[PDB]
Amino acid sequence: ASQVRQNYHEDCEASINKQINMELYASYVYLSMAYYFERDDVALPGFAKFFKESSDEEREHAQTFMKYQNKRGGRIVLQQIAAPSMREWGTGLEALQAALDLEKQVNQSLLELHSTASGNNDPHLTKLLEDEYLEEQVDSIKKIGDMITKLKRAGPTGLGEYMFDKELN
């Protein structure tokens, strides 16, 4: 084992590798959305910027798990990053709804990782998950939920979508 490894269960190590891939996948979904909103026939620059920033944040979250794996003496195993399932994301509202679903899927995986860490009596890992992942995940879900409600109020299509996008920019 690594000279640094202590109290680090193989199941936690393996689950962190799976979570790295999930965060990279989420980053790729948001990158797809960002550039979809820059198509000449879509032209929603506020949505584009929101998803660009979201993509960067998910990549940073993946990198924090990679750093964490090394800190604990685990070994990073990277796998293929699947392309998002659709080429086009529909209306701004449909993209936000897909993002909300994805954020909750990621949250569920993080909570399952927390359960694995707790069951293996790894408080360093439960602290990481609580402070660096679960907190931001709840804030992200709340933000997207607010945005969905605001967009339903404004529009969600036509002038209201145009105005909502401008406030988002």
Place this chain on the structure above:
Amino acid sequence: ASQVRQNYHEDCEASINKQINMELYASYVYLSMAYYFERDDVALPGFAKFFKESSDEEREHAQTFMKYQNKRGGRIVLQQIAAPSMREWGTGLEALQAALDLEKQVNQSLLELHSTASGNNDPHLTKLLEDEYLEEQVDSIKKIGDMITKLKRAGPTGLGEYMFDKELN
């Protein structure tokens, strides 16, 4: 011939003079649009400003071709600048659609001159076209396409046109 002339084909020289006239014509079209949008019964100051700036940019493009003709030792031949095809340009959307078509007509002319320059083995001229014209032309076409999509989303008439115009201003 001019003491400076070297590798400069008469067909390229003549086509440059045609491009100068086309750019001056485009400048005149956009000047007409700019002041149409300042009529008391139109009153779209964002559209007016957009077309004023566009008119100035096309005049600058014409001047860069005039400077180029002199750099290569060709002789500038200026001709009449045709009146724009319309006295009144309709809605903001109709003006943008006319602008998109004009920008694509200009792009086609520039690409045809690029072909003439390539066929005459004139890389100084292909460089000029690529760097000083074709690049900005694609960016302009993309910008106007985005604007058309945004205006169709906002409006394209009534309150949405009013709001889109303000964002443009």
Place this chain on the structure above:
Amino acid sequence: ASQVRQNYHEDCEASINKQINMELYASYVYLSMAYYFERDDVALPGFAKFFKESSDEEREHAQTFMKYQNKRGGRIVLQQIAAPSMREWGTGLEALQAALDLEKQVNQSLLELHSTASGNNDPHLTKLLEDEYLEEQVDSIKKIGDMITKLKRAGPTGLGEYMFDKELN
């Protein structure tokens, strides 16, 4: 077709989608290398920083192609990003040798795209490739070649690798 599309061949559009994927793959390879060099049993922070920066630059290159696709009215079609071919990259020298080979593979792909663009008489695309890709690619290959020579001189293992890494940091 898109309202903006002009002189943009479907084969060029498809090849741009391939290049986006290749750039994202290169970004992933360099990300893998960066964190390999942060393992507690590797501990080469100069190499880690070099590959982190390289990863970010390749992702930016991918994003510029995504923006380009939209500018021309093509449609981004993302593909799965393959896993890097190795979990462990060996010595610093072996990683640089792998990077040199990857940079030359990317260069070959860019030159093939350039040939496709030239054969389809698309000077906007040849300009993009020359100015935004081929130039930086030659500079990157020269930099890595220099680094390989310097590391062979210093080391390439032991104290020389330790000292070379410091200079890189």
Place this chain on the structure above:
Amino acid sequence: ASQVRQNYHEDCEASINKQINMELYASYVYLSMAYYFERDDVALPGFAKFFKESSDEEREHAQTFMKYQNKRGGRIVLQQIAAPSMREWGTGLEALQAALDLEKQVNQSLLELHSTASGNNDPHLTKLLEDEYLEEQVDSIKKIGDMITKLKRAGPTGLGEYMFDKELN
């Protein structure tokens, strides 16, 4: 009991007293190392500085536990600080290896305290341990592991030790 005491188990109080002593001992070990590296026949000022700083940090960790004991209404019971096990610490590498082992021994003790606190349903104490101790302990172990790898690469004796020490200074 103290007027402030609430949900504070006597076993946790006693274990905090043990940890205070362990931290003071670690501080003394690192103080011994620091001055060993300032002997005229050792003369490794980077190692000396690293261990001086480490000694101060361990004393601060002990003081935070003393403050904590008082915050909860426990009573500080100090114990003799044992002499370090060696008068002479050998090579820089041997000292780092001894430090790694000591850091892991302290980590094990902190994890045992965490288990005691968790079993006694004391989340204020688990929070202290996670945030103020376990986090820095993993970072310290990773840093020392990196240093051991770097020193093995550089040297670990002779010129490599001289150069590694300079980088540490």
